[PDB]
Structure 1
Amino acid sequence: GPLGSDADKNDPAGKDQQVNVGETPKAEDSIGNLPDLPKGTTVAFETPVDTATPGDKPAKVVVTYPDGSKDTVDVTVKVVDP
């Protein structure tokens, strides 16, 4: 059988973050263990996050490992009016 992928061997953990209206969150701030993922792993939001109004915004972080395998994490970006 084949050697497993990076995704098979890693488990990124989602993290909620809070931002103010208008701010642009970074996908890195929605992952709680990025140091434990392989060097060279990238993280991105699947879709840009809406921060034009307050609310709990669901988002997905796509975690792409150097071998091309991927994990997703479902997270929440909380937008508040300051």
Structure 2
Amino acid sequence: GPLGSDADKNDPAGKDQQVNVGETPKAEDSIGNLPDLPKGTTVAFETPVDTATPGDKPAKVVVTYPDGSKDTVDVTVKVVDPRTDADKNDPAGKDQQVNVGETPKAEDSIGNLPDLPKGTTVAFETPVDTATPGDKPAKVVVTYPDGSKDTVDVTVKVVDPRT
């Protein structure tokens, strides 16, 4: 019947690429075997890739051959945030007051817990000594959901209730 099309002859290969938040990915970087394909073959994303948020993005690369025939390739574009949760957040430390013998909670030594990501945890680097009154220096370790950590310097004021 007719002589075959360029798409009838070739099969383009999908390739996963990695980019940063705000970076625009190139279709060429999503195709492995571009030299196996004919000279003059162009590659483009069917849908311009969204890189405003991190995460694995689904994409379609349209392969237009010199004769006009086209092939569609399904790929994944890995979008990553170069800035960690520790870069994206600033914990507001609070100096807390307790009585002699009371155990202080690290939660009560950080005032902006909801401003921090969901799943973030707070603990004292070293347990606070409350056996005697006075201003006890402490460090609250803020462990973010991405694994990153911030460290806040606070004061635990220990008071004698019979004074």
Q: TM-score range by the shorter chain?
A: over 0.9
TM-score by length of structure 2 reads 0.47
Bigger relative contact order, structure 1 or 2, given CA contacts below 8 A and separation 6+? Answer: 1
Measured at CA, do residues 60 and 42 of structure 1 come closer, stay the same or move farther in structure 2, by a change above 3 Å? Answer: same
Deviation at 1:2, TM superposition (A): 50
Structure 2: unaligned runs, 5 residues or longer: 6-84
Measured at CA, do residues 79 and 2 of structure 1 come closer, stay the same or move farther in structure 2, by a change above 3 Å? Answer: farther
Deviation at 1:52, TM superposition (A): 0.1
Could you give the per-residue CA deviations for residues 8-66 of structure 1, whole angstroms, max 9, x where no partner exists? Answer: 10000110000000000000000010111000000000000000000000000000001
TM-score by length of structure 1 reads 0.93
Identity %: 100
CA distance in 2, matches of 1:7, 1:59: 19
Give the number of aligned pairs: 82
Q: Give 3-state SS (helix, strand or coil) of 2:107's partner.
A: helix
Q: Give 3-state SS (helix, strand or coil) of 1:34's partner.
A: coil
Match of 1:32 among 95, 98, 111: 111
Q: Could you say which structure has the larger radius of gyration?
A: 2
Structure 1: unaligned runs, 5 residues or longer: none
Identify the residue that residue 2 of structure 1 maps to in structure 2: 2
Superposed structure 1 runs of 4+ greater than 4 Å apart: 1-5
Q: Give 3-state SS (helix, strand or coil) of 1:8's partner.
A: helix
Q: Give 3-state SS (helix, strand or coil) of 1:28's partner.
A: helix
Measured at CA, do residues 63 and 81 of structure 1 come closer, stay the same or move farther in structure 2, by a change above 3 Å? Answer: same
